[PDB]
Amino acid sequence: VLSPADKTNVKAAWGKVGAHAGEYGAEALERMFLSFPTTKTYFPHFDLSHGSAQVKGHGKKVADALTNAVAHVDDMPNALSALSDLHAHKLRVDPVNFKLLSHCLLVTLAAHLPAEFTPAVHASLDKFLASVSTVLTSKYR
Amino acid sequence: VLSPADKTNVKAAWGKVGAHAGEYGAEALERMFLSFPTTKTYFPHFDLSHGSAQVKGHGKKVADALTNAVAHVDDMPNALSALSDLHAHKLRVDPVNFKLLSHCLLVTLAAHLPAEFTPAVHASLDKFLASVSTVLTSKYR
Amino acid sequence: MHLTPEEKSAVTALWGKVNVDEVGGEALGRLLVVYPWTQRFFESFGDLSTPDAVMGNPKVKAHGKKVLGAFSDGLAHLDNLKGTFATLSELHCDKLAVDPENFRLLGNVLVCVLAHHFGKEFTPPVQAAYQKVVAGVANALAHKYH
Amino acid sequence: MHLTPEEKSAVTALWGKVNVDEVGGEALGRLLVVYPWTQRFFESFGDLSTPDAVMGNPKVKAHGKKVLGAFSDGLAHLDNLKGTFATLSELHCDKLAVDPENFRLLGNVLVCVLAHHFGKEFTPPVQAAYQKVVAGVANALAHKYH
Ligand code: HEM
Ligand code: HEM
Ligand code: HEM
Ligand code: HEM
């Protein structure tokens, strides 16, 4: 569970992301495709080339969802219910892949928020992405 | 989340275990130590030799907690509070190891409860062990 | 493989007693039931709405036999699983887009099926040798992903 | 270790810019803070009660520098990690009893630290080379476990 401290940490770092969310969403995907090539198996229908609009479009959607989760940090299960359904029933992504993206998201934030990416915030952001992943995977079986 | 069917399946299977839980506990550990030798790093103070009294003893303890878990299938978090505490603050076993013990427990049940180890009971037991794992690692951070 | 002559013999000897037809159908079927998300690859098989519908589906049973078959042949090249599964690795990557994690889930299901079947015979030391083989196979199969 | 010549150059070029003293302390400190369970091996280190307590602990800083030191040496023998890390593998297992999963957590934290430090310079392609490297080191340190 996320503590008050964690909640403040996440609203704070995400706060800074602001308007670049979209772009950071795309970059996290690209990092993931390059470091964990097996994740590509879920986007056979995508142009995964550098600067692909499909990746850009997708990064934006992922970032919009995270932004939505932050806005409803006290009701994540409900705010993300629809996405939980989608992943469980249509996409059916193996649970292990959530940890891979999570990791690339952290690298992206670290690369862009030097001042805010403190040990304390790093810890809070990691617990956050793990909670997001848990919700997204809760209806798998 | 454990469905009513799941809870039923589990109570049944465990019902058949009966007075053998202790030996199954002990057998599950032995299988874990041989198959996943990295797990041994948490029992440096044990005699991990075959038929060791420490292992048998521990096997009973583990089996007992599962029993208690099955009995309070509806209130696991509360029934295992102390155990969640112990693991998170004292033992501090890495979360990946719970999956290895769970697996060795299924293999053990499978090997001893042929008739009862149907595909549907296998699915339920797996979910159950996963739930127990979640509970034991929920206070880690 | 990093199998001991003793470990090699153990694998080999239990395998000799396996009915691939039955173990294959059971392993693949259990997979689709325990880990429902693996069904994403078999929509064309029919109705997998229930354990019963999965365990009974002939398309499932036949895929299972095809899978254990290839597995079975790999046990004859235990000293070069890499080379044995190279083409199958490319195929699974490039044509099927199957996440290699599935290879590991199956492996575990396989071990449970063997225990199930051989009871007493499937001793701790015997499972240990099989755990090494299923992990080795999963690795060979995932080797050509890019 | 599928390090392409170009991936190896990239690993090497950036490592040239690292202050191992500093990075070592940050990576170790951050591990104890993000995954507190890892603190189990350091009860003789004193106060690890808070992030400042951890990040600032002279003992944490000194040990981090030691760990990264052995890691840097590893980077000079990318060809023979297993040989390079054999005595250390043995010690972590037999004397220290450190679960190898700890080596992977540290690898991921190190990658985050490198990103933190190099900003835009730690490009998608550079991250991918370091991912291969930390995995390779984690595997070499676990090779002697039994
Ligand atoms: C916290 C992590 C994740 C978040 C927030 C997330 C969120 C989303 C969202 C918002 C969409 C678009 C749904 C729509 O069409 O409205 C989506 C689709 C999708 N996601 Fe997830 N997802 C996450 C993890 C993953 C992972 C780890 C993978 C696989 C590696 C994945 C694979 C997919 C795929 C294949 C689609 C459909 C894309 C398309 O065809 O346009 N997701 N996700
Ligand atoms: C199915 C999940 C598990 C359950 C229900 C469980 C239950 C228990 C119980 C009942 C005890 C003894 C408490 C006491 O002494 O009063 C215990 C202790 C312990 N457990 Fe857990 N355990 C589980 C998973 C694990 C795993 C996966 C590991 C490591 C591989 C582990 C490592 C330990 C250790 C090292 C001890 C202390 C043994 C001693 O020194 O006596 N546990 N556990
Ligand atoms: C022990 C591991 C496995 C082995 C040895 C294996 C082997 C095979 C073989 C020999 C084929 C025949 C296709 C051809 O030659 O054209 C095949 C097809 C296929 N496999 Fe795998 N496989 C394994 C694991 C998996 C898993 C776990 C899945 C998904 C859960 C999977 C999904 C598929 C699919 C979707 C096909 C195509 C079937 C069709 O054409 O309808 N495989 N595999
Ligand atoms: C890149 C991975 C690692 C490398 C290269 C490394 C290297 C070293 C070295 C050179 C030593 C000193 C050897 C000696 O005392 O003779 C050491 C000791 C130690 N390492 Fe590792 N280490 C690594 C990861 C870890 C991790 C992740 C942990 C725990 C989370 C750990 C726990 C320890 C402990 C507890 C000691 C002994 C501390 C003491 O002196 O009391 N190591 N390590």
UniProtKB/Swiss-Prot annotation, chains A, B:
| Annotated consequence of substituting residue 47 to H | In Hasharon/Sinai; unstable
Name the reported effect of residue 20 to Q: In Le Lamentin
Q: What is the effect of changing residue 90 to M?
A: In Handa; O(2) affinity up
Indicate the impact reported for residue 68 to K: In G-Philadelphia
What does the annotation give as the result of altering residue 16 to M?
A: In Harbin; slightly unstable
Effect annotated for changing residue 139 to E: In Hanamaki; O(2) affinity up
Expression by tissue, per the entry, reads:
Red blood cells.
Result for mutant: residue 103 to R? In Contaldo; unstable
Q: What does the UniProt record report as the effect of altering residue 141 to L in this chain?
A: In Legnano; O(2) affinity up
Q: What is the effect of changing residue 129 to P?
A: In Tunis-Bizerte; unstable; causes alpha-thalassemia
In UniProt terms, what is the effect of altering residue 141 to H? In Suresnes; O(2) affinity up
Query: What does the record say mutating residue 14 to R does?
Result: In Evanston; O(2) affinity up
Recorded consequence of changing residue 44 to L: In Milledgeville; O(2) affinity up and
Q: What's the PTM story here? A: The initiator Met is not cleaved in variant Thionville and is acetylated.
Site (described: (Microbial infection) Cleavage): 8-9, 13-14, 24-25, 29-30, 45-48, 52-53, 55-56, 59-60, 91-92, 106-109, 121-122, 133-134
Something else the entry says is: Gives blood its red color.
Disease / disorder: Heinz body anemias: Form of non-spherocytic hemolytic anemia of Dacie type 1. After splenectomy, which has little benefit, basophilic inclusions called Heinz bodies are demonstrable in the erythrocytes. Before splenectomy, diffuse or punctate basophilia may be evident. Most of these cases are probably instances of hemoglobinopathy. The hemoglobin demonstrates heat lability. Heinz bodies are observed also with the Ivemark syndrome (asplenia with cardiovascular anomalies) and with glutathione peroxidase deficiency.
Q: What is this protein called?
A: Hemoglobin subunit alpha
Organism expressing this protein natively: Homo sapiens
Swiss-Prot record, chains C, D:
Q: In which tissues is it expressed?
A: Red blood cells.
Q: What happens after mutating residue 2 to R?
A: In Deer Lodge; O(2) affinity up
Indicate where the modification N-pyruvate 2-iminyl-valine is found in the sequence: 1
User: What happens upon changing residue 49 to F?
Assistant: In Las Palmas; slightly unstable
Q: Which residues carry this modification: N-acetylvaline?
A: 1
The reported result of mutating residue 24 to V is:
In Savannah; unstable
Consequence of substituting residue 128 to D: In J-Guantanamo; unstable
Q: What is the effect of changing residue 10 to V?
A: In Iraq-Halabja
The observed outcome of changing residue 67 to A is: In Sydney; unstable
Q: What is the effect of changing residue 60 to A?
A: In Collingwood; unstable
| Impact when changing residue 34 to L | In Nantes; increased oxygen affinity
**Illness:** Heinz body anemias: Form of non-spherocytic hemolytic anemia of Dacie type 1. After splenectomy, which has little benefit, basophilic inclusions called Heinz bodies are demonstrable in the erythrocytes. Before splenectomy, diffuse or punctate basophilia may be evident. Most of these cases are probably instances of hemoglobinopathy. The hemoglobin demonstrates heat lability. Heinz bodies are observed also with the Ivemark syndrome (asplenia with cardiovascular anomalies) and with glutathione peroxidase deficiency. Beta-thalassemia: A form of thalassemia. Thalassemias are common monogenic diseases occurring mostly in Mediterranean and Southeast Asian populations. The hallmark of beta-thalassemia is an imbalance in globin-chain production in the adult HbA molecule. Absence of beta chain causes beta(0)-thalassemia, while reduced amounts of detectable beta globin causes beta(+)-thalassemia. In the severe forms of beta-thalassemia, the excess alpha globin chains accumulate in the developing erythroid precursors in the marrow.
* Protein's name according to its UniProt entry: Hemoglobin subunit beta
This chain's source organism reads Homo sapiens (Human)
Q: Which gene encodes it?
A: HBB
